Design a protein around this nucleic acid. Structure first.
Length: 35
RNA sequence: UGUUUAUAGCCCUUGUUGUAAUACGUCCACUGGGGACUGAGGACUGCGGCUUGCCAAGGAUGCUGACAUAAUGGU
């Protein structure tokens, strides 16, 4: 009807900062899921 | 029992190593994580930052899932 246009959001996507101990080539236990 | 570093050492003062360290107090417009609750508003204006644009700068978005033959919300 009136078509309220949403306001401009100032949320930009930035790369996730993974844990320092999760380097590739690490042996990691799986906590959830089927495995 | 009595004495004065000797076959243990201790206390006091000064020098030195010294601009010693540390604790405590205070400050950082220094910094790295963990947790919880909230997302009001609804074109654009504004104040700013980085450089027409971009931005954490006048209030949340994005990416996915699963599930509807149930979960949620009730009564």
């Amino acid at each position: 009807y009136r078509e309220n246009v949403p306001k401009k959001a100032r949320k930009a996507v930035r790369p996730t900062k993974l844990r320092a101990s999760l380097a590739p080539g690490t042996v990691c236990i799986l906590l959830a899921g089927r495995f």
